[PDB]
Design a protein around this nucleic acid. Structure first.
Ligand SMILES: [Fe+3]
Ligand SMILES: [Fe+3]
Lengths: 458, 431, 470, 471
RNA sequence: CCGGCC
RNA sequence: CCGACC
């Protein structure tokens, strides 16, 4: 058992097995990839990496489990359950890619349109590989828990429903029973949204970025207890966390609308992702048997998944090879904060939402926009841009109870080039059937008038 | 007008010249080093970038200049003084080495013994290189600033001494006024905020409680007579932060391991810059081109290469692939006048490796397996070995070396040495 | 320019006129009036008086009006109205009598059923007496105020429209023209209940009772802004502080269900009220011109109401007079802690709510309630005591975004109790009182007791009027 | 086994005997005696009373004795001692008069200068009256106490040695044998100054005044063990809390510099004292047998002293008797804030001091000043007042040392009277004359020259050679 | 600055 | 479980 001090988490004490397994290099790659991701180009202070966020999530899940077992001993969950919860929370986001939010949102979504997968499956696979490489089976036996069940429980908590839930009204998870889901929801609240990881992320972002955290998660955990709803085990705020929970929801909205939904930071992230894509074949990491896998193709290789940090960006910034001139230009452009210029903002309408495969064609489709306007420079794939920041979850019914931001970036920063990019963005919005801009009366003095809808003020 | 959002000083007002300087390749690359260095391993919450600390210091300096100008109309504060303050607060540590203090305090001895230089020389060279590469001399001129004079004044404001005279022919201010007379407070506040260390002193109160006074017919900074509590709290916070950054057990181990990794891969790492030069990590300060490609990425890159030619070097990362840091024995304090100075910095590990204690020992280490690092007067004792017998042998050798150095007696020297500590009659005086 | 240090609001920096109003007999009388009333004999910590509460209320009213006036230079909030709101805050409780809400609550109605008296009317009367006796009016002239308007405005802020508001939907206040309709929302508010009085006494009660106060009025005051709702200027809050308002109302409910509705803090109040009643006819209090008023009629004169404070309690406890022997006796039964025992509680069904004018008639009906089974003890009329005791998205606006009169004010939010106490404490007496209480709760169309089935099995089915839960 | 909620100590559990003792008229008399006395008219939040103070002190004494008997079983602390220490903590202030320390600090020594009276004597007498009147002795016998010696023990804890020894006449206390000496330092220590009463009233004063209280008695009781010090078992603390103890003393100093010496709470206390002194001969209080006792003599009979609380203030304020007129007016000048002005402050030099018997003679000497200047104000004894604010009598002092692994060797112990003169008249020339008279009187009495003494000393200053000597 | 004294 | 129901 070892205790560490953090700005928000506080005490980092754990079990002897968890203490022994915490100081590992497999989860050190979390410390080498920023959880804030594009926040380095956004938040001057919030340079925290996935290690701090994951440790806070695990500690908060363990504290919640301890509080539930103390105030509600009817669960009869022994120390093995808490140890398994801590081991699972130690890998909350231990399967993402370089720059975190850029990989599963921009890099993985574009590198392999034919293979759509997010950080969840990658996290499960990476945690399984790390467990296999550690060889902590005798150590787990010294902890009193059988590995053949601890590994399954950790994987189920990390991923979720891993049994391909059929329409039958059985247990969706093959690890947890019909009356054993109370402990696994502390790591992530897939329905209520009150997750230890989410609260830790919100608090850390607010603290290291300069925002106000009015939530008191400790009181929520103290007053939560285990209750029965819809003939199932759950956790809810008893009577007096309505103000605290509403403040937490407002803070989450502020964080996800001011930091994860900014403008310049999204442009910087898009430029970084595009530069990595142009250099995908130029940074090959050694794999198993002496083989090599590209950073683009390493999402299915754990040798380079354990070797996928933001140092790839550093390699891109300090390439010692002569074949990376195309990526060197983008690296030099991003070195002096000379990234692209935003042409506006947009959001689609209706229930139709594009998949991961359509993201790759979205840049080409947005560049292919061509209204009846003569442009000095044609909006090509490398000249124009379609930045599609997908918004996971978000649409939660009765947030107290309980698509994608589109941006047009110009590779050229000339005034005439800016006007051409704005015209191309208007053409793309018309093609995608997007609503008129808020300042569209001036932003589109020659593109909006083409359609009679703009003139129909009534 | 550019605004930078940081939790140290909120928003920082930067004019077009200040914005261009802050938005520069060197300024952007300045955020690639750690203030706490290896202590980031020991303390997770402290991972701040150096560029943010420099920006906060510059904002504090600009605010102080504005307050001095507004409070005293007779001060006649023009744009030149504010521009010099901003340039200094920006390039105060512009070219700080890998992990800032770690490189310039550990890696210089193994870099090039012929020329000695702290982080100040590298900072001055990096600022000069940034000015040369930016090509914004007309931009600075259009703001009313003299380029050479401002650059020299900013460099002098840094630890580096502009002039040779100590106090006879003015001060080390060959381009500045010796009579004429902050960053430390801003850095301390940033470190306290990042590491979670409570700071009882507010930087704003100290900034607002400064005045220009005529002492010895010279302008000097004077504080309020009722601000002793703020001063004390500030000093306490600074000391606490310094101890946390330097005295960290894991930090210390990471430090020494970083230096070992840097030395081991001298013939397996290099850079490219002007003239197609291929210089190793030892020559990263003499040439500004080497400093341009400088980042803490080695702390991962040297740890991530998968080549057989560096397999043993890769094995250094293997020491991190199974977490086991060097054991801590103890420390002591200097006595008399004999101390391990910078000249003895490159010889102290060799002196430790050559020790022959007269005690029952079975495990010995060579120069490469023995590390002698001091905290500069306390010198800690860390043994890279993991065996209990090896640790005891290393402790006995360290005790013999300290007894031959006649240093201060340790806290529990009787337990560490049953006879070696008893050998000296001077150190056995319990009264 | 005094400043008063407070353990809740810190510094309460004042104005010379407020100091003149404060250092008077009629304001310092508040220094000996319990804020929680009888709650001191149930909560040892709640020893605070109305004096500091009134100081804090004046402070908070000044803070809110000053914040609104500095934020918005269009409302034309002058220093005159700021001072007038501060005066209304300080004088909002000048009319309290012995043991605060026990006096105009359970005492005066049970003593004088023919008079409608409230502490706000007493506040108006005491403030008029304070400005007349102490010669404040020349000072009010000095400091920019015009008494002929400002005094009426202060009285209206304390109690409401003095002049029997006319039927048409005109402006019912004769003090301020309607273009300052927001100013009548600072001190006392009935539309939504966001008034500085409630903030101050919630914080003070939580400080003195050990309860934990989560609401933070400073955040509200910062967000507080005047917005236009239903063509009238009102004070609203930023949409962020909605959770803070939830906390405030949670604190309100806690203070009500733990402090102000205490099971035994009301028994003690009943005993004190009975002691005052028995001593009402033998405690002469002098008025203006030597006219001796009693406890109950002292509300008809402000020279005799000024001399009427909590000391009356002890003035009956220390009596050597034989005429007070009964009343003093009751007070003694409290020092020994020999209080009346609880019997049961009930709630009113529908809208037929018992009023204060019927309070003096309440026990007799309980006396007329005799259970349909044998009773060992036949409790007389005075042998039982029947004591009566009186959402977040109310008419409260919520400033939407960066727009002055945005007025996002819907949010769609997305009676009384009766307690029976027994003078006798025998087991058979307890059973008889429980049976009589069950009979009363089963025949007066009132809700059945919480534990009525265990309190009395032969007085449950009395009538069908009080046996329907629909 | 009831429990009382306190804003300071949270839940306070009480033995049935403690409740029986609490629910008596003599104990409930404390509800109507303010803790800070005249500080209310200065600190609006400081309206708390002695009743909750006594409750909390009993709580703390019980907690400390229980801890000390749980850690070390060789001390052999039994339930009898626990109940006796708790009772002593409860009744340690049963004898407080109106406005607390003002009664035995300013009123009684000035109303009856020939009578010695401390509130500990009144506490002992009131406790005896409580026990006798309320039939507590049968209940004390029932639960385990033996009144003949247990009551003597409680009285000794309240006041000290019930008899008169000289220097070394063996063990003074007849309550408990010497091998339980520590039991006499819980409720009221006189050597170390660490007693469970000061903890509670420091916490309560800081709660109601808004001052910050960094001390934590829980972390003291947690690490307290009894150790031998000069062949006397004493309660001792871990050295790891010694710095914490510093905080407590720091808090103490704050409370004695802001609250108890406010220079406006003292002039208000003086005005209340003068009003009481003038209404003394006419206010009647009935005692046992109907014998009317005045306010001053009421201390001699506990039945009359039970009915003597802060209410007397209001009883003089709300009166209509012509004989009380003057007294009543001095209470009304307080209600207009038309208080008397402080002419000056000084301190005694060396070891010269004013006792409780010379307080009455002090104003006459103050009025007896004869400055060698043209003083147009003929100030008499009624035109001046002299308040001797006796400061109550160290971070180490009788320090304690519960050093780890050393449960026997406690060797780790390593680390006045103000006089304020006020003037009844309010004329500016009268104020200057009063300042000059105060300076002259302080010079004549060899007292320390005031810091602002020379401000109103343009004529008689050259007369005094020592006054001009700055060294 | 007689309910303020960082 | 009459100064408790945190
Ligand atoms: Fe009220
Ligand atoms: Fe006491």
């Amino acid at each position: 058992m070892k205790v560490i001090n953090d700005p928000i988490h506080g005490h980092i004490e754990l079990h002897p097995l968890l203490v022994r397994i915490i100081d590992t290099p497999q989860f050190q790659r979390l410390r080498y990839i920023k959880q804030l991701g594009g926040g380095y180009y956004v938040f001057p202070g919030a340079s925290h990496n996935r290690f701090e966020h994951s440790l806070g999530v695990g500690y908060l899940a363990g504290c919640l489990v301890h509080a539930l077992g103390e105030k509600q001993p009817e669960l009869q969950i022994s120390e093995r359950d808490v140890l398994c919860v801590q081991i699972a929370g130690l890998c909350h986001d231990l399967g993402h890619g370089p720059f975190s939010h850029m990989f599963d949102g921009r890099f993985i979504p574009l590198a392999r349109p034919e293979v759509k997968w997010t950080h969840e499956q990658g996290s499960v696979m990476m945690f399984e590989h790390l467990i296999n490489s550690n060889g902590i089976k005798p150590v787990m036996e010294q902890y009193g828990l059988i590995p053949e069940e601890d590994i399954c429980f950790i994987k189920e908590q990390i991923v979720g429903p891993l049994e391909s839930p059929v329409e039958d009204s059985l247990w969706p998870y093959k690890g947890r029973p019909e009356n054993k889901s109370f402990l696994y929801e502390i790591v992530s609240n897939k329905r209520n949204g009150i997750d230890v990881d989410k609260w830790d992320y919100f608090a850390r972002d607010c603290h290291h970025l300069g925002i106000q955290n009015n939530f008191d998660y400790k009181r929520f955990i103290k007053f939560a207890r285990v209750c029965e709803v819809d003939n199932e085990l759950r956790i809810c705020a008893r009577d007096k966390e309505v103000g605290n929970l509403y403040d937490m929801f407002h803070t989450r909205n502020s964080l996800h609308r001011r930091a994860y939904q900014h403008k310049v930071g999204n442009i910087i992230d898009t430029m970084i992702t595009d530069a990595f894509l142009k250099a995908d074949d130029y940074i090959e990491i050694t794999g198993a048997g002496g083989k090599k896998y590209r950073i683009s193709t390493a999402i299915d290789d754990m040798e380079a998944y354990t070797k996928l940090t933001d140092n790839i960006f550093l390699e891109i910034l300090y390439s010692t090879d002569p074949k990376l001139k195309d990526a060197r230009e983008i690296l030099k452009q991003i070195e002096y904060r000379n990234l692209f210029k935003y042409v506006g903002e947009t959001q689609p309408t209706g229930q139709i939402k594009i998949k991961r495969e359509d993201y790759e064609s979205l840049p080409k489709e947005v560049a292919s926009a061509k209204p009846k306007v003569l442009l000095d420079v044609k909006l090509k794939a490398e000249d124009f841009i379609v930045d599609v920041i997908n918004m996971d979850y978000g649409m939660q019914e009765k947030n107290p109870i309980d698509e994608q931001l589109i941006r047009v970036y110009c590779k050229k920063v000339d005034r005439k080039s800016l006007y051409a990019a704005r015209q191309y963005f208007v053409q793309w919005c018309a093609d995608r059937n997007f609503t008129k801009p808020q300042d569209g009366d001036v932003i589109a003095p020659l593109i909006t008038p083409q359609k009679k809808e703009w003139n129909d003020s009534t």
